[PDB]
Nucleic acid binder design. Structure first.
Ligand SMILES: [Zn+2]
Ligand SMILES: [Zn+2]
Lengths: 121, 117, 50, 67, 134, 74
RNA sequence: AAACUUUCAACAACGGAUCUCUUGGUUCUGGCAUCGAUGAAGAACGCAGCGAAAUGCGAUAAGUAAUGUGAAUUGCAGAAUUCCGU
RNA sequence: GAGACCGAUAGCGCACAAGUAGAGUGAUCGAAAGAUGAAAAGCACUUUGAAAAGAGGGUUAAAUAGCACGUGAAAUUGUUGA
RNA sequence: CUAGUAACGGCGAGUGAAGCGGCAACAGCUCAAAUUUGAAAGCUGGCUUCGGCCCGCGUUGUAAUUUGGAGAGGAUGCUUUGGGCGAGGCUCCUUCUGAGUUCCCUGGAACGGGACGCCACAGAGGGUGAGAGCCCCGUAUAGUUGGAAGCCAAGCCUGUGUA
């Protein structure tokens, strides 16, 4: 009835898509014969539905990880793979751009930085 | 003088004890960053403008360039050792000059400086 | 009275005495205390409105 | 300062004072000759005082307070 | 009294949190003292109850009645004990609710997580006694 | 009938002849809102519906808008 | 003489005051700064055996993955589903 | 996190199905409604009979606490007695 | 605070500042105006073996130098540096940390009364069958287990160009 996700992550792609087909054909055949005496078949349907979700999650996570391996050198990630954050956080200046300073300003900080001192009583 | 809507624009001050705690925490937060340094920068001794307050004397904004050079403090070093510098003010008399280059000389005696790296 | 006796940790007199300060000889004014305490007890109060 | 002590007790507050609506006031102090809050029989206001009390063994004692 | 600003002395916020608690923190509330023998051996005072715990009722109309836990009802803050039951009108016997604070645990239901709970309380109780002693 | 169903706000406030909603103003890009009706503002304001995406924003800020997975996860 | 009406008392009604309670409101203070074309706020349609004038979710539909805890859920049916254990 | 605040005709319109139910062509207008008991142990079984109802009997410390449910005022009403 | 002052006013209604002074907080800078002219030294994209190659912008001006209580250029002599790791620490979440269910009475039920104890840097609060410090969660205090992201940072590798 239920399939643990621990067995799900170990298998490869063709084993997933065969098992997903096996759960889906089973799920369809239940509801045809679940309309009469919906007892333990209804509990099986709930367990069949949850196992379908766990299988569909592993296929998507494996496909998304394969995409992120493919685009590891390219600079234009697809929109579905980019981080969400917020809207305003995505238009903020970069950490290196906002830390960038002029050459005149760096010259004054190099040669006259803030010192460390104290005043006695 | 209640011709306009003074009901909509009345401000109480029940945060008076709470703002004092924040202000004292801001001074403690500042002193955590500047741990051996004093919190406030050094300021010059200046005379109050008008005829009413000519006899009184207060702290100004920053030291004049002639005051810094007479004391022996370079201009570009003074903001980095706690001395505020005012380019707008002028000296205009030897009494304003001598009082402040005594103050900066007294600052240097009580100042301990640590090397860069 | 000039002196007040100092008592030990066991409750017995130690043998040292202290001079009573002049604040214990001050006037006792119930009208003053009541007036100050009425306004003093108001100073902790926290506002209410509808 | 026995008169000053009476002015605080009588006019302001006493922990031993019982007030009734029957016109007389009562003193709850166990060292009072008469349980009344008048000046002549206050154990507090009177620096020198006397009272009579009974022990549960049955002995009657005379209690004398000096200033 | 309370010191830390995150702590609240509100009866309203306390009563709301007790009666709207998740079952994870309902478990900690639903905890019972251990017996004198169990205190002197595990060096642990109080653990939450689970289903397999043999227990003894020491408060209420069912005092001095001993048995195993049958159910830990967290929604009504109730444990159920074997043979502590009453009859309905129909004659059907229903479990009687005892709060976990009215019982003393006689025998634990031990699994790997339970020894880890018992070790962590013993480690802290030993540490502070050593810190207070020396 | 003077008014019909409005696609935006779901009320029967869309004028049939003029094709402009009396409650939200559907052909207009902006939603109709006036400051002289505080009751009408609180009837359509944020928080009176599902809050389907905006409910998720407070938790992600608390974690610093982090991305990734916990260390040693399957 | 009955009945009818009036007053009082006991008992019984009607109604929800009074006392008590409070997962609600009101007001003040403090820490922090985060919606949307990567499709928001809002509007519907659906997902639970019996369900709403609730809540959660979106055809993976009262939810899936991952981490932590460590033995439940519970109004009734119902689960060889899980107890030294991914 | 708090309070010399209010305590269900109060306090936000809403302590609860509350911007809900309902009204209007529409803009908009917009309520009433908390409390059994420690625990449902929420009255089995017998017997009237067509019912949101009785008489027995039972649970409970209590049922003159029976999901019309803490206390149960007055207006108003019935029966009995003078 | 100035101050219901000055000022303006069917000089009626009235309206109505600011400077000085005591405080809170403090921080200063970027261009255009110049010829780099002994060398567009600058920048956006694309392809990328990630190392460095092309296109384009741009002389109708992109770098460096300068911004008027300044500055430039010579001369002279003293004084200053630059990168990369990084133990560890701070903030915040988490795990654990005191003591009666001793005897009697009322009670449906002790959480009440009486007797004898105990803890307390914890007698705030809530639950538990009635007023519970010691039945349960918590609360006080320092520690302690694990983790997240920022910041700081002891030290340790290198530096260089007539910059
Ligand atoms: Zn007296
Ligand atoms: Zn509309």
């Amino acid at each position: 009835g239920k399939v643990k996700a621990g067995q799900l992550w170990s298998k490869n792609k063709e084993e997933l898509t065969k098992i997903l087909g096996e759960l889906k054909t089973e799920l369809s055949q239940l509801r045809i014969q679940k309309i009469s005496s919906s007892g333990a078949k209804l509990n099986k349907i709930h367990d069949l539905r949850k196992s379908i979700a766990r299988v569909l999650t592993v296929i998507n996570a494996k496909q998304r990880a394969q995409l992120r391996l493919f685009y590891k050198n390219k600079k234009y990630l697809p929109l579905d793979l980019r981080p969400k954050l917020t809207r305003a956080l995505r238009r903020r200046l970069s950490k290196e751009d906002a830390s960038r300073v002029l050459e005149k300003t760096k010259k004054r900080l190099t040669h006259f930085p803030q010192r460390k001192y104290a005043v006695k009583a | 003088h209640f011709r306009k809507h003074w009901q909509r624009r009345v401000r109480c001050h029940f945060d008076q004890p709470g703002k004092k705690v924040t202000r004292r925490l801001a001074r403690r937060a500042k002193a955590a960053a500047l741990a051996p340094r004093p919190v406030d920068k050094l300021r010059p001794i200046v005379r109050c403008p008008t005829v009413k307050y000519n006899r009184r004397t207060r702290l100004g904004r920053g030291f004049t360039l002639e005051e810094l050079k007479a004391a022996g403090i370079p201009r570009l070093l003074a903001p980095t050792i706690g001395i505020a510098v005012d380019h707008r003010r002028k000296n205009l008399s030897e009494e304003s000059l001598a009082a402040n280059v005594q103050r900066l000389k007294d600052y240097k005696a009580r100042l301990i400086l640590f090397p860069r790296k | 009275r000039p002196t007040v006796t100092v008592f030990g940790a066991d409750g017995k007199p130690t043998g040292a005495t202290e001079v009573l300060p002049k604040v214990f000889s001050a006037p006792i004014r119930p009208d003053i205390v009541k007036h100050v305490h009425t306004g003093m007890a108001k100073n902790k109060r926290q506002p209410y409105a509808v | 300062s026995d008169e000053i002590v009476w002015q605080i007790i009588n006019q302001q507050f006493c922990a031993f004072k019982l007030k009734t609506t029957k016109g007389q006031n009562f003193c709850r102090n166990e060292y009072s000759v008469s349980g009344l809050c008048n000046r002549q029989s206050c154990p507090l206001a009177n620096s020198r005082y006397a009272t009579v009390r009974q022990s549960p063994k049955g002995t009657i004692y005379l209690y004398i307070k000096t200033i | 009294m309370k010191v830390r600003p995150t702590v609240s002395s509100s009866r309203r916020k306390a009563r709301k949190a007790h009666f709207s608690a998740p079952s994870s923190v309902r478990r900690v509330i639903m905890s019972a003292p251990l017996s004198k023998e169990l205190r002197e051996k595990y060096n642990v005072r109080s653990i939450p109850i689970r289903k397999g715990d043999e227990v003894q009722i020491v408060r209420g109309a069912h005092k001095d009645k001993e048995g195993k836990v049958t159910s830990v009802y967290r929604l009504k803050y109730v444990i159920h004990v074997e043979r502590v039951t009453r009859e309905k009108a129909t004659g059907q016997t229903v479990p009687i609710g005892i709060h976990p604070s009215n019982v003393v645990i006689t025998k634990l239901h031990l699994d790997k997580d339970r020894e880890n709970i018992l070790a962590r309380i013993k480690a802290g109780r030993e540490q502070v006694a050593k810190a207070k002693g020396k | 009938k003077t008014h019909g169903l409005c696609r935006r706000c779901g009320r029967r406030s869309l004028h049939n002849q003029k094709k402009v909603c009396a409650s939200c103003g559907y052909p207009a890009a902006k939603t109709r809102k006036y400051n002289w009706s505080e009751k009408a503002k609180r009837r359509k304001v944020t928080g009176t519906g599902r809050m389907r995406y905006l409910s998720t924003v407070p938790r992600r800020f608390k974690n610093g808008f982090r991305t990734g997975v916990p260390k040693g996860a399957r």
